[PDB]
Design an enzyme around this catalytic site. Structure first.
Site, PDB file in Angstrom:
ATOM      1  N   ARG A 123      65.131  39.399  35.612  1.00  0.00           N
ATOM      2  CA  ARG A 123      63.058  40.911  34.514  1.00  0.00           C
ATOM      3  C   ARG A 123      62.198  40.900  35.698  1.00  0.00           C
ATOM      4  N   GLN A 162      51.128  21.716  26.573  1.00  0.00           N
ATOM      5  CA  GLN A 162      49.040  21.941  26.615  1.00  0.00           C
ATOM      6  C   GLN A 162      48.655  21.748  28.059  1.00  0.00           C
ATOM      7  N   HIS A 168      46.748  24.773  29.843  1.00  0.00           N
ATOM      8  CA  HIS A 168      45.147  24.820  30.117  1.00  0.00           C
ATOM      9  C   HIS A 168      44.362  24.548  31.902  1.00  0.00           C
ATOM     10  N   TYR A 174      69.821  26.035  27.703  1.00  0.00           N
ATOM     11  CA  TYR A 174      71.152  26.484  27.896  1.00  0.00           C
ATOM     12  C   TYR A 174      71.574  25.568  28.846  1.00  0.00           C
ATOM     13  N   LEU A 204      50.902  34.379  23.341  1.00  0.00           N
ATOM     14  CA  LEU A 204      52.341  33.552  23.231  1.00  0.00           C
ATOM     15  C   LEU A 204      52.607  32.956  23.083  1.00  0.00           C
ATOM     16  N   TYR A 205      51.358  31.679  23.654  1.00  0.00           N
ATOM     17  CA  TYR A 205      51.431  30.128  24.153  1.00  0.00           C
ATOM     18  C   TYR A 205      50.801  29.599  23.257  1.00  0.00           C
ATOM     19  N   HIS A 216      50.800  25.774  18.838  1.00  0.00           N
ATOM     20  CA  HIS A 216      50.513  24.772  17.564  1.00  0.00           C
ATOM     21  C   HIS A 216      51.587  24.398  16.451  1.00  0.00           C
ATOM     22  N   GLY A 256      57.790  35.976  26.603  1.00  0.00           N
ATOM     23  CA  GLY A 256      57.140  34.899  27.693  1.00  0.00           C
ATOM     24  C   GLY A 256      57.564  34.125  28.571  1.00  0.00           C
ATOM     25  N   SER A 278      55.975  33.731  32.531  1.00  0.00           N
ATOM     26  CA  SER A 278      56.235  32.104  33.120  1.00  0.00           C
ATOM     27  C   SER A 278      56.944  32.127  34.365  1.00  0.00           C
TER      28      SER A 278
HETATM   29  C1  LIG Z   1      65.280  30.795  25.278  1.00  0.00           C
HETATM   30  O1  LIG Z   1      64.951  29.504  25.509  1.00  0.00           O
HETATM   31  C2  LIG Z   1      63.539  30.478  26.877  1.00  0.00           C
HETATM   32  C3  LIG Z   1      63.143  29.539  25.915  1.00  0.00           C
HETATM   33  C4  LIG Z   1      61.692  30.082  27.544  1.00  0.00           C
HETATM   34  C5  LIG Z   1      62.586  29.888  28.705  1.00  0.00           C
HETATM   35  C6  LIG Z   1      63.069  30.351  28.329  1.00  0.00           C
HETATM   36  C7  LIG Z   1      63.732  30.807  27.720  1.00  0.00           C
HETATM   37  C8  LIG Z   1      63.624  30.669  29.985  1.00  0.00           C
HETATM   38  C9  LIG Z   1      64.825  31.403  30.673  1.00  0.00           C
HETATM   39  C10 LIG Z   1      64.789  32.755  30.957  1.00  0.00           C
HETATM   40  O2  LIG Z   1      64.040  33.372  31.493  1.00  0.00           O
HETATM   41  N1  LIG Z   1      66.186  32.919  31.020  1.00  0.00           N
HETATM   42  C11 LIG Z   1      66.510  34.543  31.717  1.00  0.00           C
HETATM   43  C12 LIG Z   1      67.933  35.691  30.520  1.00  0.00           C
HETATM   44  C13 LIG Z   1      68.337  36.294  32.273  1.00  0.00           C
HETATM   45  C14 LIG Z   1      68.639  37.703  31.084  1.00  0.00           C
HETATM   46  N2  LIG Z   1      69.358  39.011  31.394  1.00  0.00           N
HETATM   47  C15 LIG Z   1      69.480  40.095  30.317  1.00  0.00           C
HETATM   48  O3  LIG Z   1      68.506  40.139  29.727  1.00  0.00           O
HETATM   49  C16 LIG Z   1      70.089  40.591  31.484  1.00  0.00           C
HETATM   50  C17 LIG Z   1      70.043  41.725  31.877  1.00  0.00           C
HETATM   51  C18 LIG Z   1      70.317  42.065  33.015  1.00  0.00           C
HETATM   52  O4  LIG Z   1      71.142  41.204  33.930  1.00  0.00           O
HETATM   53  O5  LIG Z   1      69.905  43.501  33.495  1.00  0.00           O
HETATM   54  C19 LIG Z   1      68.798  43.396  34.426  1.00  0.00           C
HETATM   55  C20 LIG Z   1      68.129  44.802  34.233  1.00  0.00           C
HETATM   56  C21 LIG Z   1      68.032  45.595  33.068  1.00  0.00           C
HETATM   57  C22 LIG Z   1      67.208  46.332  32.824  1.00  0.00           C
HETATM   58  C23 LIG Z   1      66.710  47.442  33.287  1.00  0.00           C
HETATM   59  C24 LIG Z   1      67.024  46.309  35.027  1.00  0.00           C
HETATM   60  C25 LIG Z   1      68.140  46.173  35.404  1.00  0.00           C
HETATM   61  C26 LIG Z   1      68.423  45.597  36.781  1.00  0.00           C
HETATM   62  C27 LIG Z   1      68.426  46.357  37.103  1.00  0.00           C
HETATM   63  C28 LIG Z   1      68.465  46.879  38.355  1.00  0.00           C
HETATM   64  C29 LIG Z   1      69.122  47.345  38.900  1.00  0.00           C
HETATM   65  O6  LIG Z   1      69.594  48.141  39.850  1.00  0.00           O
HETATM   66  C30 LIG Z   1      68.244  49.924  40.002  1.00  0.00           C
HETATM   67  C31 LIG Z   1      70.812  47.475  38.471  1.00  0.00           C
HETATM   68  O7  LIG Z   1      71.269  48.343  39.190  1.00  0.00           O
HETATM   69  C32 LIG Z   1      71.572  48.285  40.817  1.00  0.00           C
HETATM   70  C33 LIG Z   1      71.084  47.056  37.498  1.00  0.00           C
HETATM   71  O8  LIG Z   1      72.027  47.443  36.610  1.00  0.00           O
HETATM   72  C34 LIG Z   1      73.155  46.762  37.416  1.00  0.00           C
HETATM   73  C35 LIG Z   1      71.125  46.342  36.518  1.00  0.00           C
HETATM   74  C36 LIG Z   1      68.644  44.044  36.924  1.00  0.00           C
HETATM   75  C37 LIG Z   1      68.857  43.822  37.963  1.00  0.00           C
HETATM   76  O9  LIG Z   1      69.060  44.230  39.103  1.00  0.00           O
HETATM   77  O10 LIG Z   1      69.614  42.214  37.363  1.00  0.00           O
HETATM   78  C38 LIG Z   1      69.709  42.128  36.742  1.00  0.00           C
HETATM   79  C39 LIG Z   1      69.498  43.091  35.863  1.00  0.00           C
HETATM   80  O11 LIG Z   1      66.578  48.151  32.991  1.00  0.00           O
HETATM   81  C40 LIG Z   1      66.919  48.027  31.350  1.00  0.00           C
HETATM   82  O12 LIG Z   1      67.428  46.650  31.742  1.00  0.00           O
HETATM   83  C41 LIG Z   1      62.410  30.952  30.298  1.00  0.00           C
HETATM   84  C42 LIG Z   1      61.758  31.374  32.050  1.00  0.00           C
HETATM   85  N3  LIG Z   1      61.763  30.663  29.777  1.00  0.00           N
HETATM   86  C43 LIG Z   1      60.316  30.584  29.958  1.00  0.00           C
HETATM   87  O13 LIG Z   1      59.338  30.024  30.943  1.00  0.00           O
HETATM   88  C44 LIG Z   1      59.055  31.054  29.329  1.00  0.00           C
HETATM   89  C45 LIG Z   1      57.598  29.945  29.065  1.00  0.00           C
HETATM   90  C46 LIG Z   1      56.753  30.143  28.687  1.00  0.00           C
HETATM   91  C47 LIG Z   1      57.340  31.601  27.260  1.00  0.00           C
HETATM   92 CL1  LIG Z   1      56.208  31.476  25.595  1.00  0.00          CL
HETATM   93  C48 LIG Z   1      58.181  31.994  26.962  1.00  0.00           C
HETATM   94  C49 LIG Z   1      59.621  32.166  28.049  1.00  0.00           C
HETATM   95  C1  HEM Z   2      46.751  18.501  20.277  1.00  0.00           C
HETATM   96  C2  HEM Z   2      45.916  19.369  19.203  1.00  0.00           C
HETATM   97  C3  HEM Z   2      45.420  20.549  19.867  1.00  0.00           C
HETATM   98  C4  HEM Z   2      43.898  20.771  19.379  1.00  0.00           C
HETATM   99  C5  HEM Z   2      43.052  19.417  18.483  1.00  0.00           C
HETATM  100  C6  HEM Z   2      44.525  22.341  19.489  1.00  0.00           C
HETATM  101  C7  HEM Z   2      42.898  22.777  19.584  1.00  0.00           C
HETATM  102  C8  HEM Z   2      42.655  24.041  20.202  1.00  0.00           C
HETATM  103  C9  HEM Z   2      40.928  24.731  20.332  1.00  0.00           C
HETATM  104  C10 HEM Z   2      40.668  23.913  19.265  1.00  0.00           C
HETATM  105  C11 HEM Z   2      41.664  25.735  20.933  1.00  0.00           C
HETATM  106  C12 HEM Z   2      40.157  27.174  21.290  1.00  0.00           C
HETATM  107  C13 HEM Z   2      41.006  28.054  20.425  1.00  0.00           C
HETATM  108  C14 HEM Z   2      39.266  29.124  20.212  1.00  0.00           C
HETATM  109  O1  HEM Z   2      38.298  28.475  21.382  1.00  0.00           O
HETATM  110  O2  HEM Z   2      39.785  29.698  19.799  1.00  0.00           O
HETATM  111  C15 HEM Z   2      42.859  26.167  21.435  1.00  0.00           C
HETATM  112  C16 HEM Z   2      43.524  26.673  22.654  1.00  0.00           C
HETATM  113  C17 HEM Z   2      44.633  26.417  22.824  1.00  0.00           C
HETATM  114  N1  HEM Z   2      45.665  26.259  22.402  1.00  0.00           N
HETATM  115 FE1  HEM Z   2      45.331  24.385  21.604  1.00  0.00          FE
HETATM  116  N2  HEM Z   2      45.377  22.395  20.589  1.00  0.00           N
HETATM  117  C18 HEM Z   2      46.877  21.770  20.143  1.00  0.00           C
HETATM  118  C19 HEM Z   2      47.559  21.938  21.467  1.00  0.00           C
HETATM  119  C20 HEM Z   2      47.627  22.569  22.140  1.00  0.00           C
HETATM  120  C21 HEM Z   2      49.376  22.473  22.258  1.00  0.00           C
HETATM  121  C22 HEM Z   2      50.285  20.974  21.993  1.00  0.00           C
HETATM  122  C23 HEM Z   2      49.372  23.969  22.607  1.00  0.00           C
HETATM  123  C24 HEM Z   2      50.767  24.142  23.288  1.00  0.00           C
HETATM  124  C25 HEM Z   2      50.489  25.041  24.075  1.00  0.00           C
HETATM  125  C26 HEM Z   2      48.441  24.845  22.615  1.00  0.00           C
HETATM  126  C27 HEM Z   2      48.019  25.804  22.966  1.00  0.00           C
HETATM  127  C28 HEM Z   2      46.356  26.364  23.424  1.00  0.00           C
HETATM  128  C29 HEM Z   2      46.841  27.508  24.027  1.00  0.00           C
HETATM  129  C30 HEM Z   2      47.596  28.730  25.021  1.00  0.00           C
HETATM  130  C31 HEM Z   2      45.225  27.860  23.919  1.00  0.00           C
HETATM  131  C32 HEM Z   2      43.811  28.795  24.580  1.00  0.00           C
HETATM  132  C33 HEM Z   2      43.267  28.151  25.579  1.00  0.00           C
HETATM  133  C34 HEM Z   2      42.318  29.678  26.271  1.00  0.00           C
HETATM  134  O3  HEM Z   2      42.409  30.493  26.396  1.00  0.00           O
HETATM  135  O4  HEM Z   2      41.252  28.709  27.035  1.00  0.00           O
HETATM  136  N3  HEM Z   2      47.263  23.564  22.054  1.00  0.00           N
HETATM  137  N4  HEM Z   2      43.817  24.590  21.125  1.00  0.00           N
END
Ligand SMILES: COc1ccc2c(c1)c(CC(=O)NCCCCNC(=O)CCC(=O)O[C@@H]1c3cc4c(cc3[C@H](c3cc(OC)c(OC)c(OC)c3)[C@@H]3C(=O)OC[C@H]31)OCO4)c(C)n2C(=O)c1ccc(Cl)cc1
Ligand code: HEM
Ligand SMILES: COc1ccc2c(c1)c(CC(=O)NCCCCNC(=O)CCC(=O)O[C@@H]1c3cc4c(cc3[C@H](c3cc(OC)c(OC)c(OC)c3)[C@@H]3C(=O)OC[C@H]31)OCO4)c(C)n2C(=O)c1ccc(Cl)cc1
Ligand code: HEM
Ligand SMILES: *[C@@H]1O[C@H](CO)[C@@H](O[C@@H]2O[C@H](CO)[C@@H](O)[C@H](O)[C@H]2NC(C)=O)[C@H](O)[C@H]1NC(C)=O
Ligand SMILES: *[C@@H]1O[C@H](CO)[C@@H](O[C@@H]2O[C@H](CO)[C@@H](O)[C@H](O)[C@H]2NC(C)=O)[C@H](O)[C@H]1NC(C)=O
Ligand SMILES: CCCCCCCCO[C@@H]1O[C@H](CO)[C@@H](O)[C@H](O)[C@H]1O
Ligand SMILES: *[C@@H]1O[C@H](CO)[C@@H](O)[C@H](O)[C@H]1NC(C)=O
Ligand SMILES: *[C@@H]1O[C@H](CO)[C@@H](O)[C@H](O)[C@H]1NC(C)=O
Ligand SMILES: *[C@@H]1O[C@H](CO)[C@@H](O)[C@H](O)[C@H]1NC(C)=O
Ligand SMILES: *[C@@H]1O[C@H](CO)[C@@H](O)[C@H](O)[C@H]1NC(C)=O
Lengths: 551, 552
Positions: free
Chosen positions: A89, A172, A176, A324, A353-354, A357, A495, A499
């Site tokens: 992706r 957190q 940050h 996973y 997204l992140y 809280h 996300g 990430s």
């Molecule tokens: C669920 O729990 C969590 C929570 C957080 C996670 C995570 C997990 C994770 C893990 C994570 O992200 N894992 C990823 C899982 C893998 C997802 N895989 C899929 O959805 C299948 C997609 C796939 O294999 O096909 C792609 C693809 C798909 C397409 C596309 C193109 C392609 C693209 C593609 C290109 C091609 O060439 C043109 C292709 O033909 C050759 C092709 O088909 C073969 C596909 C991709 C490729 O080349 O290899 C895989 C292919 O256009 C339309 O849709 C992270 C990193 N996370 C975070 O870091 C994270 C951090 C903070 C936040 Cl807030 C959120 C997440």
């Molecule tokens: C532990 C006590 C925590 C307190 C008291 C707190 C409180 C706050 C406050 C006051 C803000 C500023 C909001 C604004 O300025 O409008 C903030 C922002 C934020 N908080 Fe928390 N929070 C806590 C924990 C967490 C945790 C665990 C996460 C997990 C990722 C988190 C993620 C964030 C993020 C991503 C922002 C935006 C920061 C920025 O853009 O500068 N916080 N939080």
């Protein structure tokens, strides 16, 4: 007024006004053609037919434990799948970056001005008839009502994935360094000009601040000893600016890279751990290089800790979050024969997204105490009272709250959740469903499909009327979680690309950097490649207490 | 003292001290192994046997005109060959960047601090026994002696490739958007934080300066009309800071993006042309988009002019310099299936290599006048007197000087040439031959091999004693040129990779930017893809005078 207000172009086609009431979609390289880029090319249909949904892939990654264990022990195969996870992706993040809060079209200003968060979707134009463009009412629902009806915690809802406070505060602390909103400028602006994992939250954003934090002997950071334990130095000793209430005693005004980390003892805990880690690595490098000076010892240590951070985030942090059975791997070499941009610009939506809280508990439980928010906030005497070892032991055992699934924002930070809603609007975010489409997800067709329930769905329907007008941020927190998971689909699929890009895009992952001499030789290199959250704690916390991101 | 002072690691292996008197070479991905990375792997030896020398390739590209004419009309092959030209230096440049004047090892400071020029080779460490490391004497030859003996012009030597003053000032104008040394900090520092073709020399480096230069109507830049002709506005009217001597009339202190462009009327000529081009593109976009505001017209025009600049630089400017029969092409799509980093950091060595002052004539000939340097410098009344049309016509006709081949730096700028030598030393540059090896060239084994002659070579030998201690900058200007060429091998092989990287690395060349809507639609896009030095002049200069980068 802007004919692009309805977001008519699909599949990442670009809308351009061609007159006062006409638009053109630029369908270049979307794989689609036609007026709004909705007619697929032949190769495009094929891809669509074969492509599994995110939920399907997630099922596969969270089942068949026996098969994955086999996979996990075949390096060629493990590398192949991890390479896949990384690239698969890649195409979802614009790099070089494009839009920001002030530019809904590409411009040199938006590209070059690093004070902006970038934008995955351009803002809704100012002269659009509705907040979301053309759909919905003239005003969005009262944010206080959205908050109270579906966001605020009634009873504490524990995370079924078992995330703990070690995880919560790591998240957190880690985030940050690149989420640092410049509030004098506005919500769409950042103070993190490095736009990524540069560890400015340890070393300081500017050189002047960095130099105030440094010992200038042996590459080390300044520190003090309290009761035989190493802690960060004071504001008095370093003159680095920190945010503290005026009643904080001077001996308790700890100085660290990030000015707000005195906010909570949980942040100060990790600041202390990483400071100790820096000075530990200095000792190792000095041993390896008696001929090195202070400057090179400092710089090399910083590069190693950057490496450790990325290593831990992928293989412990993201690993835990993902649920996973596959073993994620930090290995820059996986991208060396791939097209990949070693750069990153932090997206506003990533920041949004992140806001996790709901993770926060009703009380913070350390040893035999249960501290209220009021007792915990800006109180480092708590850290001193109990010590790091007890902090780690306690936080490892205390469970965190579920983030998706609704109604789990603690009232203590209700103003923060409300501000997330209000600032999303201020920054003219497009709707939930626009963001879902932007990341190749199917639009939700009702509020009940979003929540997977009945009561919150209904309150939402009364508030928003149209599912296509539902907002991104509250949707994330009320979304139907994945089975026994902390997040729903939208959180994960939006996300994850931000990430991995923020982690792998770092210059130390580039081929010219990713070699032993960058890190002072094979010993420095090994520190990165063997790092873990457990070893981080084991090496820097007295007694080497057991730790983990789950209870 | 530093055991790495002798530069022991070869083939881009990296040297690291492992104690007070031992080193280790990191041979990772060099294709070589062993203590100083000099033993090639099997695949490497093969690669070495087959790869032709730069001089061989230069011969091929500058001969067989009949064949190249066939190729130039076969798009697949023209594209294939151009793709090749682009991806053939692409590895010689570190991207993300690494070293700088203060860091001979990779560091977060060196990576992140944009106020530095980056470095293709790390500096010689401060505690090394000699300037070049361990070779040569305790101090390098008197720079005044190197200057006077082999750099200063005796008789004017014309460029055999026929470069004219349109070319020379284009080079000065174009490069001075990314070569902007911050003299308050030191020679290893830059004020050009965009590190590339961002056209700050038109629009200003900062937002504050840009807004003072803008009209805020129709996307346009402020201008004045003098005798029916469009010129930049004044400092008096804008409060834009410019560098002028205090005796310059207020009506003659033109204000433009780059504060030093009042230095010579030749810079002000191009500043004026590009200013006119911006406002022209504003008129075109306003016609296409009557619904657009001032801000979008301004930003979109700037992107278009960035495109035009890259287009002209590749297909007219580099085309002329190269002397190739092959027709170079600006086409970002060529890199879309390639590994390529859309970013750039300006290298100090690139700056040094681009000091092309031998280009300058002894006098500047406009219409029937021949101005001395003293008369020409800081004198915008000359531009007003003759006008743009006469400037273009005159500068198109006046030949520029040969850059390599020695003894062709005009005495008027002798202090500039000396400063290039002295600041190179100040920045602890490694030797000519180290830089040659760094760009996969064979080290010169004597001064006569370097110059291709005897007299200058003998003077250099008396001064430097050892060829391995010869310096980069003077070497560039005394090097044996390619046959009837303006430059020698070192200039081309070091400069070309920096140049292309700076051009293709621009974000407008990336796939999410390179599409019509970025530039306001197909009309805006076409402006970029049909741009040329002749069209730039034809559209903005009265009478559409003929121009070219070579004399006719
Ligand atoms: C669920 O729990 C969590 C929570 C957080 C996670 C995570 C997990 C994770 C893990 C994570 O992200 N894992 C990823 C899982 C893998 C997802 N895989 C899929 O959805 C299948 C997609 C796939 O294999 O096909 C792609 C693809 C798909 C397409 C596309 C193109 C392609 C693209 C593609 C290109 C091609 O060439 C043109 C292709 O033909 C050759 C092709 O088909 C073969 C596909 C991709 C490729 O080349 O290899 C895989 C292919 O256009 C339309 O849709 C992270 C990193 N996370 C975070 O870091 C994270 C951090 C903070 C936040 Cl807030 C959120 C997440
Ligand atoms: C532990 C006590 C925590 C307190 C008291 C707190 C409180 C706050 C406050 C006051 C803000 C500023 C909001 C604004 O300025 O409008 C903030 C922002 C934020 N908080 Fe928390 N929070 C806590 C924990 C967490 C945790 C665990 C996460 C997990 C990722 C988190 C993620 C964030 C993020 C991503 C922002 C935006 C920061 C920025 O853009 O500068 N916080 N939080
Ligand atoms: C003549 O006067 C001027 C003056 C200025 C010029 C210019 C010209 C120019 C034009 C310009 O850039 N000219 C460059 C000359 C042409 C360059 N082309 C070559 O050198 C061909 C090299 C070649 O074909 O071999 C490579 C190659 C070589 C290797 C190597 C690998 C490869 C590599 C390779 C990879 C392989 O596996 C895939 C190979 O096996 C299949 C393989 O063959 C064995 C080769 C390259 C490839 O895949 O295609 C070309 C191959 O390992 C070590 O040596 C510019 C841009 N200029 C500027 O812009 C400029 C501006 C300012 C300044 Cl100061 C200087 C210059
Ligand atoms: C036409 C009259 C010219 C004059 C009077 C002139 C004079 C100067 C001066 C005074 C400097 C500053 C040296 C220092 O600060 O140490 C300089 C630097 C420089 N010159 Fe020229 N020059 C001229 C033409 C050119 C041309 C035609 C080129 C072609 C490329 C050129 C390329 C450069 C470059 C790349 C620098 C370094 C700029 C920097 O680092 O900021 N100059 N010149
Ligand atoms: C990045 O863009 C912001 C947004 O315009 C710039 O901040 C403005 O700067 C102008 C002129 O310097 C001031 O008049 C405004 O008051 C500023 N507005 C805000 C909201 O801060 C900022 O200067 C730009 N950064 C750079 C390096 O150019
Ligand atoms: C980039 O590096 C330069 C050189 O170290 C920094 O400039 C120094 O800043 C310190 C403290 O801010 C001053 O005491 C020195 O006088 C400065 N030296 C020079 C040569 O200017 C500059 O601050 C760095 N830039 C960033 C953004 O960190
Ligand atoms: C802790 C915050 C209590 C919310 C009080 C404001 C009115 C909230 O509203 C209501 O809350 C009820 C309580 O669970 C739910 O049954 C309803 O669905 C919700 O609409
Ligand atoms: C999308 O294109 C269709 C034609 O295929 C057109 O009917 C429609 O109006 C366009 N956009 C919107 C927002 O309806
Ligand atoms: C700060 O923490 C201590 C425990 O070390 C606690 O006794 C005290 O009440 C707290 N202060 C406030 C203002 O809550
Ligand atoms: C390079 O290594 C060789 C051994 O292969 C050694 O003889 C030599 O001293 C080293 N370096 C130099 C500059 O001679
Ligand atoms: C400036 O140029 C004019 C020609 O327009 C010339 O007459 C005058 O002498 C020049 N000034 C100087 C100081 O040389």
């Amino acid at each position: 007024a802007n004919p692009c207000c309805s977001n008519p172009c699909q599949n990442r086609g670009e809308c351009m006004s061609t007159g006062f009431d006409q638009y053109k979609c630029d369908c270049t390289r979307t794989g689609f053609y036609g007026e709004n880029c909705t007619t697929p090319e032949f190769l495009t249909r094929i891809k669509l037919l074969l492509k599994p949904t995110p939920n399907t892939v997630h099922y596969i990654l969270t089942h068949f434990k026996g098969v994955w264990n086999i996979v996990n022990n075949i390096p060629f195969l493990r590398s192949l799948i991890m390479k896949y996870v990384l690239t698969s992706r890649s195409y979802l993040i614009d790099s070089p970056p494009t839009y920001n809060v002030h530019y809904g079209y590409k411009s040199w200003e938006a590209f070059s001005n690093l004070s902006y968060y970038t934008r995955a979707l351009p803002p809704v134009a100012d002269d659009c008839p509705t907040p979301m463009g053309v759909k919905g009412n003239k005003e969005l629902p009262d944010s206080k009502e959205v908050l109270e009806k579906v966001l605020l915690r009634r009873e504490f809802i524990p995370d079924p994935q078992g995330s703990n406070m070690m995880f919560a505060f790591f998240a957190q602390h880690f985030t940050h360094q690149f989420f640092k909103t410049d509030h004098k400028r506005g919500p769409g602006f950042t103070r993190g000009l490095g736009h990524g994992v540069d560890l400015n939250h340890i070393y300081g954003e500017t050189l002047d601040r960095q130099h105030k934090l440094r010992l200038f002997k042996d590459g080390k950071l300044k520190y003090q000893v309290i009761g035989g334990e190493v802690y960060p130095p004071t504001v008095k000793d370093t003159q680095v600016e920190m945010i503290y209430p005026p009643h904080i005693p001077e001996n308790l005004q700890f100085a660290v890279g990030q000015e707000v980390f005195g906010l909570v003892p949980g942040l100060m805990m990790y600041a202390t751990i990483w400071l100790r880690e820096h000075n530990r690595v200095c000792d190792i490098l000095k041993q390896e290089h008696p001929e090195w000076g202070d400057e090179q010892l400092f710089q090399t240590s910083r590069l190693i800790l950057i490496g450790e951070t990325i290593k831990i985030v992928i293989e412990d942090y993201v690993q835990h979050l993902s649920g996973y059975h596959f073993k994620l791997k930090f290995d820059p070499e996986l991208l060396f024969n791939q097209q990949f941009q070693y750069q990153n610009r932090i997206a506003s939506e990533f920041n949004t997204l992140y806001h996790w809280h709901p993770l926060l508990p009703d009380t913070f439980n350390i040893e035999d105490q249960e501290y209220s928010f009021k007792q915990f906030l800006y109180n480092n005497s708590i850290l001193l009272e109990h010590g790091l070892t007890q902090f780690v032991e306690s936080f490892t055992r205390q469970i965190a709250g579920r983030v998706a699934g609704g109604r789990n924002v603690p009232i203590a930070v209700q103003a923060v959740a409300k501000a997330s809603i209000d600032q999303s609007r201020e920054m003219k975010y497009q709707s939930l469903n626009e963001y879902r489409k932007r990341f190749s997800l199917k639009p939700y067709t009702s509020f009940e499909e979003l929540t997977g329930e009945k009561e919150m769905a209904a309150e939402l329907k009364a508030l928003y009327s149209d599912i296509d007008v539902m907002e991104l941020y509250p949707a994330l927190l009320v979304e139907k979680p994945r089975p026994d998971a902390i997040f729903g689909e939208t959180m994960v699929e939006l996300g994850a690309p931000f990430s991995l890009k923020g982690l792998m895009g770092n210059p130390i992952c580039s081929p010219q950097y990713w070699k032993p001499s960058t890190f002072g030789g094979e010993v420095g290199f090994k520190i990165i490649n063997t790092a873990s959250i457990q070893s981080l704690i084991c090496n820097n916390v007295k007694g080497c207490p057991f730790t983990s991101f789950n209870v």
